[PDB]
């Protein structure tokens, strides 16, 4: 019994600091929004940077908030033309019985454009 939590955030320059600050901000907001008390509830956490963010790891930021307990992994989300640039996306996996429609997703900064519209196309 697991739920997924999507996250997203943008930076304004590809520097180690701005990546780490944006990662911690998004991570800590995602936990607070869902009421995550401890890291023991997380099974694992996954990150995606774009092609243009390279100078530092999302893991290095996640380790400076005590998530050595948490399994981490990162890669590069598809380099799609015209997509929102310099965006870090998070999928944290959460051992919980919470309903799917309850989980708070956290889209921050300029990445709120990626917030799923409730009625978009729906073919």
């Amino acid at each position: 019994m697991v739920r997924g939590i999507r996250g997203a955030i943008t930076v304004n320059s590809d520097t180690p600091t701005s990546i780490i600050i944006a990662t911690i901000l998004l991570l800590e907001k995602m936990l607070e929004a869902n009421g995550i008390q401890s890291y023991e509830e997380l099974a694992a956490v996954i990150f995606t940077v774009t092609e243009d963010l390279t100078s530092a790891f999302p893991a290095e930021a996640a380790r400076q908030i005590g998530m050595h307990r948490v399994p981490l992994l990162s890669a590069r989300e598809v380099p799609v033309p015209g997509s929102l640039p310099r965006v870090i996306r998070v999928l944290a996996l959460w051992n919980t019985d919470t309903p799917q429609d309850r989980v708070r997703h956290v889209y921050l900064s300029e990445a709120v454009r990626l917030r799923p519209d409730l009625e978009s196309a729906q073919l």
Partner: protein, 171 residues
Amino acid sequence: KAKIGIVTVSDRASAGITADISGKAIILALNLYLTSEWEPIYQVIPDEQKVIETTLVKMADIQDCCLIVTTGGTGPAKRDVTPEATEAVCDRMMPGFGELMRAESLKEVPTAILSRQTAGLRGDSLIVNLPGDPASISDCLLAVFPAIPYCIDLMEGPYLECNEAMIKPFR
């Protein structure tokens, strides 16, 4: 033991409606950058000009922190009074801080010329404005912080030790 003031300016966060976030980012960037012992003095206050004047003055003289940072209240909405409160409490203006940050958030967002950020000195203390967006707080803090340890040293303030990995100070 050096000291730094962080001030969040927003009626939303001061009333407890929303998490400050913007000030949390300033503290995070300052836990980076700085290798030396440092203590943060941090309050969240509303868009009241006299209330901003007090927290700055209390931090600059009574707390005597060498560097004070503000966030919010720098735009063109009549609410925003953060720059005006800085010009009353400072003897002198450091115009290079606002001019640089306005151009370095500009090559990323063009609606950054709509900012009224500024910076000044209250005797021995250096006060700098930042906006509300955290993503441009790192971009603005990164752009002016190299000169700050040298500036604080010029005012005989505490020596700021910088991290070669996270930032690059010039002396």
